[PDB]
Design a protein around this ligand. Structure first.
Ligand SMILES: *[C@@H]1O[C@H](CO)[C@@H](O[C@@H]2O[C@H](CO)[C@@H](O[C@@H]3O[C@H](CO)[C@@H](O)[C@H](O)[C@@H]3O)[C@H](O)[C@H]2NC(C)=O)[C@H](O)[C@H]1NC(C)=O
Ligand SMILES: *[C@@H]1O[C@H](CO)[C@@H](O[C@@H]2O[C@H](CO)[C@@H](O[C@@H]3O[C@H](CO)[C@@H](O)[C@H](O)[C@@H]3O)[C@H](O)[C@H]2NC(C)=O)[C@H](O)[C@H]1NC(C)=O
Ligand SMILES: *[C@@H]1O[C@H](CO)[C@@H](O[C@@H]2O[C@H](CO)[C@@H](O[C@@H]3O[C@H](CO)[C@@H](O)[C@H](O)[C@@H]3O)[C@H](O)[C@H]2NC(C)=O)[C@H](O)[C@H]1NC(C)=O
Lengths: 61, 149, 47, 249, 50
């Protein structure tokens, strides 16, 4: 595309268009629910903590 | 109808066999107001309390009921690490019967940085009442109206 | 109709028949951590 | 009032050559220690009337581990005729000390059944989803006992049915629920965090089904090590009622 | 969710005991199996059934 100085700038606008298209795609991706970014999805991963100082008893008395 | 309750606290190295009078609690059954009035601790008692905290001991509270004896244990290490903040709760039946008490501390931590002599001067306590609660029953009247409407 | 590189209809039909034959099944797990919004995608037959 | 203990094999049937003597008064209560020692075997200790702990698998390493734990094991005993819910704990080597005490008037209420949490139970999900996407944390207590009390007097209208939720570690009632027109056989089932108890109503001839559930808030605590000494919070309690046309034996 | 309604009917389809019945139901014991979703249920009392 290099033929003059002014079109070298229009190439940047051509790139900016695809950049904003990628931004739109990311916005739709996040609105759908593709990217987790949420507490429930991290709770899908949390491992149960250890139990300490156990007790016990009954009613035999 | 105003009745006084006796509140004793425990302080030892590792066992617990000594009990002393800390203050008087006033309870009025008909209204439902609970008031506390306890004396201030001496310097020797404060030092013993600080020594017990570093020994991760136990803080037993005795509340005789008119007889029965109710005791509750609470870690004093968190009490000393944080500011003095105890919460007392009486448990009653549907009639004039006493079940027991529990002492609860809001901080409830185990970091244990340091305690300053300015901190342990005043006692910060709150007494609350927890009467039994009535559970709900089947809400069939609303269901019948919803079906009709 | 509008024939445009017809290769998607056969694969879709084959996958649909394979899923219809196998109602409740567990084939394999994927090591990749996946979100819970793709669960209707993946199981489609397991309660 | 004699107590004896046998050590047999569940596969073949022949008993082993290891059996401990029993003396003093009859054995009061026992619990199974999760910790294992000797070869691959777990430890069983029992309580006598003199308030002493007796260990079945006498082993130097067993005693070493028990002394290492020391303030880690608690004991709650429940009496019906006495109506006293008192607790003890181990100190240093082997000695009984009172920690938390509870008394209930026998003339008003009477203990019927006491259920707890099963030792072999693992939870997969520690929370639940809510309306939009926000998460809701549960309240799981490995050390918590539910006691059921019934009215001594039996009348057409005057009937008292209630359940007390107490912690066996520290004397503290979480939730205490009471009915007004319930009488008859009461069945209670305890689970991960929800309690299912059934009763019968004298006013209207029917069986009502009450389900109780414990729920925490939106934010979690430490969630690395659970203990009843800490965690100064009161979980939310949810109740609902249904109708079941049966007896539920 | 399903709208709340205080009516529970005993469906005949959800009947584990099709023919074999227990005269007196003292208790039942549930044991977890090893696969994932299998529990061995044994009902004791006047008879034994598994
Ligand atoms: C003596 O006791 C009283 C009452 O127990 C204490 O007042 C309480 O002080 C705490 C913090 O000092 C307050 O906590 C606050 O809670 C709000 C939400 O409610 C939160 O947004 C704040 O960031 C803070 O955590 C509490 O509300 C307040 N009142 C109570 C508990 O009823 C008082 O601080 C105690 N004095 C000393 C010297 O400890
Ligand atoms: C949540 O609970 C866990 C478990 O109780 C806490 O982790 C533990 O925290 C204590 C106190 O900081 C650590 O004790 C440390 O011991 C060393 C000597 O071994 C001492 O030099 C330190 O000054 C400290 O006292 C303990 O090691 C640590 N355990 C683990 C496995 O990390 C945790 O701090 C709690 N978190 C919150 C936010 O409450
Ligand atoms: C509940 O149990 C009774 C038995 O006390 C069932 O009746 C019997 O059911 C069996 C099969 O479960 C029948 O056996 C059949 O026999 C024919 C030949 O006669 C054979 O070709 C079949 O393959 C089968 O083995 C038996 O005839 C039948 N007896 C009577 C008198 O009806 C009853 O069906 C059970 N209830 C059910 C299954 O809902």
């Amino acid at each position: 595309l290099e033929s003059s100085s002014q079109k070298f700038l229009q190439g940047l606008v051509y790139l900016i268009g695809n950049l904003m298209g990628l931004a739109l795609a990311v916005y739709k991706c996040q609105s759908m629910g593709l990217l987790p970014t949420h507490a429930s999805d991290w709770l899908a991963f949390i491992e149960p903590p250890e139990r300490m100082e156990f007790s016990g008893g009954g009613l035999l008395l | 109808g105003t009745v006084g309750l006796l509140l004793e606290h425990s302080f030892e190295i590792d066992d617990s066999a000594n009990f002393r009078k800390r203050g008087s609690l006033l309870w009025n059954q008909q209204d439902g107001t609970l008031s506390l009035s306890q004396r201030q601790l001496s310097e020797e008692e404060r030092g013993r309390l600080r020594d017990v905290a570093a020994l991760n001991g136990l803080y037993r509270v005795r509340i005789p009921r008119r007889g029965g004896y109710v005791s509750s244990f609470v870690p004093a290490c968190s009490l000393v690490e944080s500011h003095l903040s105890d919460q007392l709760t009486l448990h009653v039946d549907v009639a004039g019967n006493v079940v027991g008490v529990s002492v609860v501390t809001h901080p409830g931590g185990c970091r244990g940085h340091e305690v300053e002599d300015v901190d342990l001067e005043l006692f910060n306590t709150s007494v609350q009442l927890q009467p039994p609660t009535t559970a709900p029953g089947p809400e069939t009247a609303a269901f019948i109206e919803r079906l009709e409407m | 109709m509008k024939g445009n590189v017809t290769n998607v209809l056969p694969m879709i039909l084959i996958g649909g028949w394979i899923n219809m034959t196998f109602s409740g099944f567990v084939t394999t797990k994927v090591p990749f951590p996946l979100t819970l919004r793709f669960k209707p995608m993946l199981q489609q037959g397991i309660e | 009032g004699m107590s004896s203990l046998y050590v047999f094999n569940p596969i073949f049937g022949k008993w082993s050559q290891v059996a401990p003597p029993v003396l003093k008064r009859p054995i009061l209560q026992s619990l199974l220690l999760p910790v294992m020692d000797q070869d691959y075997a777990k430890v069983l200790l029992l309580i006598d009337d003199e308030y002493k702990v007796t260990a079945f698998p006498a082993t130097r390493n067993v005693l070493r581990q028990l002394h290492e734990l020391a303030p880690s094991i608690f004991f709650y005993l429940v009496d019906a005729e006495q109506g006293r819910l008192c607790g003890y704990r181990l100190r240093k080597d082997l000695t009984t000390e009172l920690s938390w005490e509870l008394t209930i008037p026998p003339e008003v209420q009477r203990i019927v059944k006491v259920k707890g949490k099963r030792s072999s139970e693992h939870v997969h999900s520690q929370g639940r989803v809510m309306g939009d996407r926000s998460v809701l944390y549960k309240s799981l207590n490995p050390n918590l006992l539910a006691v059921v009390t019934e009215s001594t007097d039996a009348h057409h209208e005057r009937t008292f049915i209630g359940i007390f939720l107490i912690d066996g570690v520290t004397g503290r009632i979480i939730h205490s629920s009471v009915q007004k027109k319930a009488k008859g056989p009461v069945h209670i089932v305890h689970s991960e965090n929800w309690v299912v108890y059934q009763y019968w109503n004298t006013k209207a001839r029917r069986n009502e089904f009450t389900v109780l559930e414990l729920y925490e808030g939106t934010e979690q605590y430490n969630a690395t090590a659970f203990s009843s000494l800490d965690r100064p919070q009161l979980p939310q309690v949810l109740q609902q009622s249904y109708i079941f046309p049966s007896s539920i034996s | 969710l399903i709208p709340y309604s205080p009516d529970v009917q005993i469906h005949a389809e959800r009947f584990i005991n099709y023919n074999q019945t227990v005269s007196r139901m003292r208790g039942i014991y549930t044991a977890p199996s090893g696969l994932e979703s299998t529990c061995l249920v044994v009902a004791y009392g006047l008879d034994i059934y598994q």
